[PDB]
Amino acid sequence: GPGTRTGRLKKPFVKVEDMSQLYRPFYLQLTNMPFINYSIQKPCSPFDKGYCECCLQKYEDLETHLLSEQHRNFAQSNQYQVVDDIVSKLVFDFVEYEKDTP
Amino acid sequence: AGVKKDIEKLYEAVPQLSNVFKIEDKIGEGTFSSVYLATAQLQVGPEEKIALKHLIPTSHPIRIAAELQCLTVAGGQDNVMGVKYCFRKNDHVVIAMPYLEHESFLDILNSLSFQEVREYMLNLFKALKRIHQFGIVHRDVKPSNFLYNRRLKKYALVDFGLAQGTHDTKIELLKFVQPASLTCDCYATDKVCSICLSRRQQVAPRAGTPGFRAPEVLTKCPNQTTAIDMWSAGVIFLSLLSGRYPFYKASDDLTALAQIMTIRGSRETIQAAKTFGKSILCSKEVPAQDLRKLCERLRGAGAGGWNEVPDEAYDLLDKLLDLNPASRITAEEALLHPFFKDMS
Ligand SMILES: O=c1[nH]c([C@@H]2CCCN2)nc2c1oc1ccc(Cl)cc12
Ligand SMILES: [Cl-]
Ligand SMILES: [Zn+2]
Ligand SMILES: [Zn+2]
């Protein structure tokens, strides 16, 4: 059982494992496996905080992270040169208005 | 009111937009972006509606640039969205693209003729053929990323924000987007032991959307190809033929796999997964369903050319929903399938 990490999976289950046995298996145990429900009316299905790539950092709240020292530093850095280089090839073809003066 | 504040904060984030666009409404949202309808005036054309895509500011510059490179290199032809311009202030990037007025997939699903289904799939395959020729694996093919205007017969595959490159991709920037295990005797049984439980987890690509991921994605195959997009196209086709959307409804990858096995069969899925290095064990066998019977029972055979769907439709569906990614039909091959007779 749980104390010795040894036993058998309670059914029903699905178990997936890499064939070379290098990685942890992954499991699905549900009370009810999926069932195709044809009676439910169409179009219903017949079966009816994050990470910042710039800072390499998980965050608890997005707006607080966007204000962190790490992120503001990145946001104002030269790291977007790769973006700007592509933008410089695009052609601006819209009408641009002067800022409106009250 | 919430959209109103979102719009106000978008002008604040990228102030140049205020002198070019009138931002009207939010028209789409995903994990990595929000898309707005705006109006603009062209220097040498009429007034135009524009889609403004605001990328999440946690996006890495290389990922932003790779999306732009997909749009400029591969887009603008063959039903693939292109790009007009792009505006940046610091970490806030807004991509400006032509707006295409488009249907709600859910609303029109059971108000489409069979012939419109054929035209929709043909045009989806034209877009997929185009992006796959450049070695782009889109990863997020689904109705909300395939704009359809029925009256104009216009189509646009959108959103390269999750794409990955094939080994020989023509989108250069996609190449740069971001306790030893022992064997055990639990293999291919219902057993667990401390050996297999204590191994590190396999990591494989899975960016996408619930219900559209191919079996090799759900089972963490490290070597994914453009075939994953063909699976997703098959899921769209399954929705069109069955009248059900979303077809799959799963809050995790293995639940999605279990639903696929109720459609395509557990033994069949197990056999295919072995060819890509995955052992799948189900506690109870589930039979494969006949695709014609399943779709017609779910849709209710009725008016629209729907009383006489040709065998070729379900044959094509079988090839798109091929559980084996190596044999699964390609977009170039799908365009040659007899389902599309009398259209070339
Ligand atoms: O990249 C996109 N994503 C998306 C969706 C919304 C955000 C996740 N994918 N929509 C569009 C995208 O580009 C568009 C161009 C014109 C129009 Cl009308 C819509 C879109
Ligand atoms: Cl056993
Ligand atoms: Zn950050
Ligand atoms: Zn074990």
Numbering used by the authors:
A (entry chain B): 207 to 254, 293 to 346
B (entry chain A): 38 to 215, 346 to 471, 534 to 573
From the reporting publication:
CDC7 is an essential Ser/Thr kinase that acts upon the replicative helicase throughout the S phase of the cell cycle and is activated by DBF4. We conclude that CDC7 activity is controlled by DBF4 at two levels: (1) via ordering of the activation loop dependent on the ZF domain-DBF4 motif M interactions; and (2) via the control of αC insertion through by DBF4 motif C (Hughes et al., 2012).
To facilitate crystallization of the catalytically competent constructs, we replaced 22 KI-3 residues retained in the previously characterized construct, but not visible in the structure, with a pentapeptide linker Gly-Ala-Gly-Ala-Gly (the deletion designated Δ467–533). Crystal structures of the XL413-bound and nucleotide-bound complexes were refined to 1.4 and 1.8 Å resolution, respectively. Here, residues Cys351, Cys353, Cys360, and Cys363, all which are invariant among metazoan CDC7 orthologs, coordinate a single metal ion, nucleating zinc-finger (ZF) domain. The ZF domain nestles on motif M of DBF4, sandwiching it against the C lobe of CDC7. Crucially, this interaction pins back the beginning of the CDC7 activation loop, inducing it to adopt a stable conformation. The current structures will be informative for the design of competitive active-site antagonists of CDC7 kinase.
